[PDB]
Amino acid sequence: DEWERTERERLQDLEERDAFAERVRQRDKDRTRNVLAEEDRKAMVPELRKKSRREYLAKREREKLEDLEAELADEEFLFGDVELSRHERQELKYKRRVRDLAREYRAAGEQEKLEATNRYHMPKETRPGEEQRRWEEARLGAASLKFSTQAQQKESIQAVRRSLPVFPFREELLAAIANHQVLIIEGETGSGKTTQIPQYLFEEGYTNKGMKIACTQPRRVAAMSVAARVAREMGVKLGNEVGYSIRFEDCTSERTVLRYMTDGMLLREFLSEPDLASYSVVMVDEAHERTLHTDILFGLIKDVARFRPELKVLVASATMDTARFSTFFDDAPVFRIPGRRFPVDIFYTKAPEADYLEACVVSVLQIHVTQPPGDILVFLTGQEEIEAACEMLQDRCRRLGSKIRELLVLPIYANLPSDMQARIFQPTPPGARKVVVATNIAETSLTIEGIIYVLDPGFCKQKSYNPRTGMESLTVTPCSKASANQRAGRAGRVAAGKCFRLYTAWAYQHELEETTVPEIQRTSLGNVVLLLKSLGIHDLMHFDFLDPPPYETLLLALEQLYALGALNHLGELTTSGRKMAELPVDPMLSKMILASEKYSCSEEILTVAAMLSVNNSIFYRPKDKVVHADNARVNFFLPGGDHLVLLNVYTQWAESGYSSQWCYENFVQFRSMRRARDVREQLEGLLERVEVGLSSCQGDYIRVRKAITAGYFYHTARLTRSGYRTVKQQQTVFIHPNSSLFEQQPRWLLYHELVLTTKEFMRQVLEIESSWLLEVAPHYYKAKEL
Amino acid sequence: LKRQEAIAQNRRLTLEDLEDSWDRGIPRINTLFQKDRHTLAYDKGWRVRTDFKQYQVLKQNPFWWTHQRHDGKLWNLNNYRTDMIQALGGVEGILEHTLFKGTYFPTWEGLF
Amino acid sequence: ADRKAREAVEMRAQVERKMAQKEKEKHEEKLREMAQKARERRAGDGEARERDEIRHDRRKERQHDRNLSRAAPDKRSKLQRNENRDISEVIALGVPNPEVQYDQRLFNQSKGMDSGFAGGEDEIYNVYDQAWR
Amino acid sequence: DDFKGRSAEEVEEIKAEKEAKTQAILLEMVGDLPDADIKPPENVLFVCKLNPVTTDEDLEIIFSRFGPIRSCEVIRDWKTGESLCYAFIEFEKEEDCEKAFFKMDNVLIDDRRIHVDFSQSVA
Amino acid sequence: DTKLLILALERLKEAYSVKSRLNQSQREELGLIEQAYDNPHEALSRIKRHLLTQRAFKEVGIEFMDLYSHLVPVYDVEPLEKITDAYLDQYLWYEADKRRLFPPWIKPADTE
Amino acid sequence: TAQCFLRVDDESMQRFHNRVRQILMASGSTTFTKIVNKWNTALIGLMTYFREAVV
Amino acid sequence: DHNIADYMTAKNNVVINYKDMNHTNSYGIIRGLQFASFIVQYYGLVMDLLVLGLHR
RNA sequence: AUGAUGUCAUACUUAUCCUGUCCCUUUUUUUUCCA
């Protein structure tokens, strides 16, 4: 098939790849010049002992570090249980006390240091969250007036195991798929379809012949959860035979039979081994999730399904998506699991409503006041709405005093500080109610036990990308039937629930569209379009889609890539073009990274990329500390723009030694910072392959802004006296309020986002020269237009 | 003590532990919980500083010795008003002395 | 006098420093004793198999650690410690329980940062603090 | 004083003397070596970056070039035997150790640019 | 520093609590307080510049407060320097009390 | 073991008296309710400081 | 810090002005500065030391 | 004898304005000799 043309290309891909890397190391052995009595010798032998000694000091203390850690790492899982004897027992006493002695005989020296810099030193003329416990002993000091059972665990595991909606459905489903290679398996959450199924497969030996069993998930954290769960079931260590591989974190060994991953992870395994010949089975979970990676894997694995009939295709999901599922997949049989723990009474408003956020408020008010025990889940659209919500709720709490009971309002969304995410996971303080205000982040993968009420105002904030304008707008959107059903289904998992729809049966049954548009239509796909072009294709049109994009969307993609220089004038791959597809993240960024090669601003452009990878959550902007926050922000504000702002911010953080309290003092989201650092480090781990020399701009931000241009020339606007307006389409934009240039308002502007919130917007913007534009893109940007 | 036990039994100190002693104490226990504890843990030397304001402002403070945000609020004379009315006679005895009945307002609860 | 006092401060400082230094080293010699007798006191039906497990686990651990540091300079420092600080991670990992907090009907019942005594003003009506009825 | 007021050089040199003394006493603390820091024989090179396919025989071959060998010891992962991709190699002369070193540093054998440094072993 | 400067400026507005007919000079001082309340970093830049380079200041005016039994001097400083000193006041007292400069017998203390 | 007998100091009585004196003196330009607001402020400031030395 | 010590000490030495008389402070302290609380209590610490002695 | 150049404040014009403005949902990309 086109599959075979692909793997043709891809095996030749691996051949040419290995040979290329080998050629390059030969090149470097060429470039690199191997230029390699009595008292001279007896001189430097003391100096070779100098270095032997000192490198040995670090080396010996390093080996001490190794076995040091190893003693306790070893006594973690052997001693505290078993009936063990004299030898290793005595040596546990030994290694216990002995690593104590090491820590102690070093803590002595550090004690000397700090005690002897405690002291008084005449000045010399030369030209963690406890500001509310350091103000709670101010008061108590101002107010002082003095003058076997592991087998038992296994029993419990199996005993719960047996009660799944799949444990009695065990055998016949096994025999069924033994018949059919492609078996669609419809079942809702809690059935265990993600957990019990791969076990069944393994105990049935599909791992024999050394084979593996893949489980893909759309979310890292969900994969980690799943893997922990099934490794506990299987009674082994997570990582050796049951393992998960996600970006930045391998948790597998060559004992791994049961390997969990992401959809992009599996696509990238096709960047390793087109056949998956070590995998006997791929089980794709929750495919309904509608990601670009799901919709690529569908095609690729369907190819493999026709090409590899000894291979096994399992695709499980939550909802009615089996119609199109089977139909695209040659109408595979559909095994139905019935799985739904407890019931929901789903209510509708009497009528349609005008003020649905307030309606949220007054609803939970009534519910809390009247209802029996039980936790509440409420949806909003997102951040600003949601804090306004807790505003209103806690204000009415203030007014209603002891007339009511303790209402643990907790907001939760994606960018809010991670301690504040975790805070909802604590068991509720007896007698009080806990209400979680949430976004559709709480649709999926977050498991909050205790929630017995669920309120849906029936909406969502969906992105919508029109390509005719290049505009993606995160705007309000009445949420689908599948949405409302699943938002409701979030409930019940331990008891009878309720689901209050802020809209009637009429609007529900009548004007409810089934599914969110399968992602590939609505999204922008520059990295992804390019990825499929460089992954076994030329004709990008008759390709085996599930849902193709509009030819419009594809045409825009092609023009994007050509103009940027990834495409020839006929649409195939340049050296610049390939290098970017292999490079992780999109091209515009990729073009900028290549531009660092020309501009000798390698490190700085690297760190910038690392920032734009995650930005959306950098700076925490609380209402209760607005001014000090704006301040720890306004500190770094550099001349040139937000990108070099980010550059210095990261620079200063790592400067502090990757300090968390640093960002805590300086109002920065530690999550964003450290994941960005990781993406830059693995970028550097790509950097050798993409042939980048590690260079500094030596403080010359001109190179920086110019590499930014050489990447993002497309993303530019100019001054018009009727506002800031595009360079090309002359459609009218506005600057984000929180821009480091927001009041600077430059004449020649570069951005990184293009949205239209309440008005058209652009994010991560910088001031440029129109001259660099004739430096870089005289074929795309001509002078007369500037 | 209750704070220790709230750490040991790890409970949350609830309103029932502190509604009894809610304006008692010297700072005042209801200063523990005010809005701006966070930026008032940074105001040190406030007592000397209000003493010395007398050389900077041309007016004379009668509460130089204290601070309402920091020391609490240390007197409550809300019943003075109530007993003043009952001793003068009650609102009816009190408004037989005034022009109230010549306004033809129907009752005195609304007066503003 | 300022020069003289600077000198005497520094001389007294380094005297006392050196005294406590020597005392620290004596402490350390006692701990040298502790270590020697520690291994001495150490040296002299599950343990044999748990012990093949000892060297099995530890030695494949050295395998993975060497090989980490060899594929990437410290891929041990890029894998194992970096495994264990982020929060969603830990919650999925079932690690348990990884200060006083109390009810929120307590907080923010008063807002303001200035004493109500208006800074020495008198002529304003602030006697009682509740509107009459 | 005067263990500080001599230079900056010998100052930090004394502190490196220390760092040694402390790391030694530390490593004996956690208990590896029987006798404290006895000077290592000048006649063994520790040669790392090695190949699991180069053996005692071949390494003793190539390091037979510069001096009379007393042994070639690639320490073995015990219950599987796989070469540890490093080694100790044992000469008769200081001159033999040195002459092997100063030509064999960072050379490519079996397509790997191995490293030679002298033995740090007190083992 | 923004906590220390917020405390400074609150202390300074307490003078003009009533917002009387004040004058030109008090109108101008209130303007300075508000603009440094809006842009708290132009302020702190200005402050630390003053503290670093200035050693010749404007002149201060004097007058007396008559307490009928003796008089009290009252000094009038210029609003720019009033702000730099308010900040330095807060800062020195915070640091001095954290480092424990003043032993416990120095007694207008904040504890009682 | 002992008793403390308290009294208001002489100079504190005199300072209260001078404070009332300047109320009355600067009141030909105040309205009845401001004269009484200043009286109320001064008298609370005395009674709540001394509190049983006044008795 | 010698910078802050110098700012404080040079700020006490200003020209003091009443209706039409002017003079220059050179000896004592202007108590109407805002750090003058700090200066008075530090000086008073030094004089506590002269009264009690360092041992007591 | 009137040049443009201007970071010049002042003066001046249009019965020219005082009513035409504001904060993102979800989440994913494989990696390489250590020394």
UniProtKB/Swiss-Prot annotation, chain A:
Superkingdom, taxonomy of origin: Eukaryota
Annotated positions binding ATP: 187-194
A cellular component annotation (GO) from this entry: spliceosomal complex
Limits of the Helicase C-terminal domain: 363-536
Result for mutant: residue 347 to I: In NMOAS; uncertain significance
Entry comment describing in which tissues the protein is expressed: Expressed in the spleen, thyroid and testis. Also expressed in the brain and cerebellum.
Motif (DEAH box): 285-288
Polar residues composition-biased segments: 148-156
Enzyme class per UniProt: hydrolase
Outcome after substituting residue 462 to H: In NMOAS; uncertain significance
Biased composition (Basic and acidic residues): 5-36
Effect of residue 439 to M: In NMOAS; uncertain significance
Compartments, record wording: Nucleus; Nucleus, Nucleoplasm; Cytoplasm
Phosphothreonine modification, residue list: 477
EC number: 3.6.4.13
Family statement: Belongs to the DEAD box helicase family. DEAH subfamily. DDX16/PRP8 sub-subfamily.
Disease affiliated with this protein: Neuromuscular oculoauditory syndrome: An autosomal dominant neuromuscular disorder characterized by variable features including myopathy, neuropathy, hypotonia, joint contractures, growth delay, chorioretinal lacunae, sensorineuronal deafness, agenesis of the corpus callosum, and seizures.
Known function: Required for pre-mRNA splicing as a component of the spliceosome. Contributes to pre-mRNA splicing after spliceosome formation and prior to the first transesterification reaction. As a component of the minor spliceosome, involved in the splicing of U12-type introns in pre-mRNAs. Also plays a role in innate antiviral response by acting as a pattern recognition receptor sensing splicing signals in viral RNA.
Descriptive protein name: Pre-mRNA-splicing factor ATP-dependent RNA helicase DHX16
From-to range in the entire protein, with total length: 162 to 1021 of 1041
From Swiss-Prot, chain C:
Superkingdom, natural source: Eukaryota
Localization per record: Nucleus
Cross-link named Glycyl lysine isopeptide (Lys-Gly) (interchain with G-Cter in SUMO2), sites: 111
Ranges for region Disordered: 18-85
General function of this protein: Involved in pre-mRNA splicing as component of the spliceosome. As a component of the minor spliceosome, involved in the splicing of U12-type introns in pre-mRNAs. Required for the specific splicing of CDKN1A pre-mRNA; the function probably involves the recruitment of U2AF2 to the mRNA. May recruit PPIL1 to the spliceosome. May be involved in cyclin-D1/CCND1 mRNA stability through the SNARP complex which associates with both the 3'end of the CCND1 gene and its mRNA. Involved in transcriptional regulation.
Homology family: Belongs to the SNW family.
SUBUNIT field: Identified in the spliceosome C complex. Associates with U4/U6-U5 tri-small nuclear ribonucleoproteins (U4/U6-U5 tri-snRNPs). Component of the minor spliceosome, which splices U12-type introns. Interacts with SKI, SMAD2,SMAD3, RBPJ, RB1, PABPN1, MAGEA1, SIRT1, FOXN3, U2AF2, DAXX and ATP1B4. Interacts with PPIL1. Interacts with VDR and RXRA; preferentially associates with VDR:RXRA heterodimers. Interacts with NCOR2. Interacts with MAML1. Interacts with NOTCH1 NICD; the interaction involves multimerized NOTCH1 NICD. (Microbial infection) Interacts with human papillomavirus type-16 (HPV16) E7 protein.
Full protein name: SNW domain-containing protein 1
The organism of origin for this protein: Homo sapiens (Human)
Region of the whole protein represented: 294 to 438 of 536
Swiss-Prot record, chain D:
Domain RRM: 43-121
Intracellular or extracellular location(s): Nucleus
Any coiled-coil regions, as ranges: none
Residue location of crosslink Glycyl lysine isopeptide (Lys-Gly) (interchain with G-Cter in SUMO2): 4, 15, 21
Tissue specificity remark: Abundantly expressed in kidney but has a ubiquitously low expression pattern in other adult tissues.
UniProt superkingdom: Eukaryota
Role noted for this protein: PPIases accelerate the folding of proteins. It catalyzes the cis-trans isomerization of proline imidic peptide bonds in oligopeptides.
The family this protein is said to belong to: Belongs to the cyclophilin-type PPIase family. PPIL4 subfamily.
Name this polypeptide is given: Peptidyl-prolyl cis-trans isomerase-like 4
Species in which this protein is naturally found: Homo sapiens (Human)
Annotated gene: PPIL4
Residues of the full protein shown: 198 to 320 of 492
Curated annotation (Swiss-Prot), chain G:
Transmembrane domains' residue ranges: none
Domain notes: The MPN (JAB/Mov34) domain mediates interaction with TSSC4 and SNRNP200. Has structural similarity with deubiquitinating enzymes, but lacks the residues that would bind the catalytic metal ion. Contains a region with structural similarity to reverse transcriptase, presenting the classical thumb, fingers and palm architecture, but lacks enzyme activity, since the essential metal-binding residues are not conserved.
Cellular compartments annotated: Nucleus; Nucleus speckle
Quaternary organization: Part of the U5 snRNP complex. Component of the U4/U6-U5 tri-snRNP complex composed of the U4, U6 and U5 snRNAs and at least PRPF3, PRPF4, PRPF6, PRPF8, PRPF31, SNRNP200, TXNL4A, SNRNP40, DDX23, CD2BP2, PPIH, SNU13, EFTUD2, SART1 and USP39. Component of the U5.U4atac/U6atac snRNP complexes in U12-dependent spliceosomes. Within the minor spliceosome, which acts on U12-type introns, interacts with PPIL2 and RBM48. Core component of U2-type precatalytic, catalytic and postcatalytic spliceosomal complexes. Found in a mRNA splicing-dependent exon junction complex (EJC) with SRRM1.
Protein name per the record: Pre-mRNA-processing-splicing factor 8
Organism: Homo sapiens (Human)
Tissue: Widely expressed.
